[PDB]
């Protein structure tokens, strides 16, 4: 009613001011990045919590404070070898500059002769991926709780000219309160106008990526649709054993919904999962507000989500600091640090 229009009116003005403030903060750090704020011998490495192409994330303990952190370690030589210097520089530069409730928190970064290191707040709830596969699927209220955090995070990143490009349950950490922290900024980029790199996870790729088109931040809104679908269904909308078969499904303009999906969910998803850019929610003239005002989100108090005052429909359990029961077990590997500096010029800004 009239109260709702007034409420919406003042909250939008308040988001615009928040965003302009957040862009000034970000730009200061983006243009003059922090470097070399810690060292390796100050941390006991406890457990590998995840791996990737050039390294791994470990639970570590900062010996001087006793605090637990998650430390990402990347092998400089592997990076150069696979020609991915720019992407790894992007990741660190962005992470050191952003600040938002649903992003991982970079506390320290440094490098030595062999590796790059990023020390971030430890999120003990594990990856959404693990709970999603175990449980099978999330209820619509559970999925919506998470989707709402993504919507605000993307509104925030996009207003900073950042494109994220790798949304998926694997890349969403759960904190102690059951809230999300987006990780894996390896494919994120600050861009004005179009970009062309073929990157992302097959199931989540927007059709304009697959079609070698040139693309923009609308790919993130498409990905949100895939994410919402997978959370609510237990499987993604487009899958197959060979990536080419996934891509053909993505570009066909066809999606089928489980019979248990609400009408409202199906409608949100048909609009997010639009092959036509000029028709995709998130990318029209009202932008993100078409998503925020869709009926599926009717129960969502956007400001209360931001302030983390909403009760999480699900919370992983944990027993004290440094517990890792919410993580899978990986093979461990001792960290050898070379006597000779490797790839020094390439990573000099890091």
């Amino acid at each position: 009613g009239n109260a709702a229009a007034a409420k919406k009116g003042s909250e939008q003005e308040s988001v615009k001011e928040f965003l302009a403030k957040a862009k000034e903060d970000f730009l200061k750090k983006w243009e003059n990045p922090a470097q070399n704020t810690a060292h390796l011998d100050q941390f006991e490495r406890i457990k590998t919590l995840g791996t990737g192409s050039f390294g791994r994330v470990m639970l570590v303990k900062h010996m001087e404070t006793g605090n637990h952190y998650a430390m990402k370690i990347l092998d400089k030589q592997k990076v150069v070898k696979l020609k991915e210097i720019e992407h790894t520089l992007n990741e660190k530069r962005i992470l050191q500059a952003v600040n938002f409730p649903f992003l991982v928190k970079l506390e320290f970064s440094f490098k030595d002769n062999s590796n790059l290191y990023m020390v971030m707040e430890y999120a003990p709830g594990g990856e959404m991926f693990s709970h999603l596969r175990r449980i099978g699927r999330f209820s619509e209220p559970h999925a919506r709780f998470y989707a709402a955090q993504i919507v605000l995070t993307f509104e925030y990143l996009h207003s900073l000219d950042l494109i994220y490009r790798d949304l998926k349950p694997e890349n969403l950490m759960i904190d102690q309160q059951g809230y999300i922290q987006v990780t894996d900024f390896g494919l994120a980029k600050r861009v004005k106008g179009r970009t062309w790199t073929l990157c992302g996870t097959p199931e989540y790729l927007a059709p304009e990526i697959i079609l070698s088109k040139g693309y923009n931040k609308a790919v993130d809104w498409w990905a949100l649709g895939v994410l919402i679908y997978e959370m609510a269904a237990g499987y993604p909308p487009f899958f197959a054993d060979q990536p080419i078969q996934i891509y053909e499904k993505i570009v066909s303009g066809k999606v089928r919904f489980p019979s248990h999906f609400s009408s409202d969910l199906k409608d949100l998803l048909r609009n997010l999962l639009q092959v036509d850019l000029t028709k995709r929610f998130g990318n029209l003239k009202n932008g993100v507000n078409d998503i925020k005002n869709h009926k599926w989100f009717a129960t969502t108090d956007w400001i209360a989500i931001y302030q983390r005052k909403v009760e999480a429909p699900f919370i992983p359990k944990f027993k004290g600091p440094g517990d890792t029961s919410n993580f899978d077990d990986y093979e461990e590997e001792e960290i050898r640090v070379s006597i000779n500096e490797k790839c020094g010029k390439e990573f000099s800004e890091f």
């Binding site: 991915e84 992407h87 694997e170 494919l187 990157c199 996870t201 499987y235 197959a240 054993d241 990536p243």
Partner: peptide, 20 residues
Amino acid sequence: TTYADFIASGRTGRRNAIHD
């Protein structure tokens, strides 16, 4: 069912990104 087809697929583990 689609769920059975997913679970029987090679795509239920952690998915890698492409970058090439």
